[PDB]
Coordinates of C-alpha atoms in Angstrom, one line a residue:
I2 CA 131.6 167.9 27.7
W3 CA 132.5 165.9 31.3
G4 CA 135.0 164.0 32.6
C5 CA 134.4 161.6 30.2
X6 CA 133.7 162.2 26.3
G7 CA 133.2 157.1 26.2
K8 CA 136.1 154.5 26.4
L9 CA 138.9 156.7 26.0
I10 CA 139.3 157.9 29.8
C11 CA 136.2 157.1 32.1
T12 CA 138.8 157.2 35.2
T13 CA 142.1 158.6 36.4
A14 CA 142.9 158.5 39.9

Protein backbone atom coordinates (compact mmCIF):
# COMPACT_ATOMS: atom_id res chain seq x y z
CA ILE A 1 0.00 0.00 0.00
CA TRP A 2 2.57 2.51 -1.19
CA GLY A 3 2.59 5.23 -3.82
CA CYS A 4 2.51 2.39 -6.32
CA UNK A 5 0.25 -0.70 -6.20
CA GLY A 6 2.58 -1.61 -10.09
CA LYS A 7 2.07 -0.84 -13.76
CA LEU A 8 -0.83 1.41 -12.86
CA ILE A 9 0.55 4.75 -11.74
CA CYS A 10 4.19 4.66 -10.72
CA THR A 11 4.44 8.35 -11.53
CA THR A 12 2.54 11.50 -10.64
CA ALA A 13 4.20 14.88 -10.93
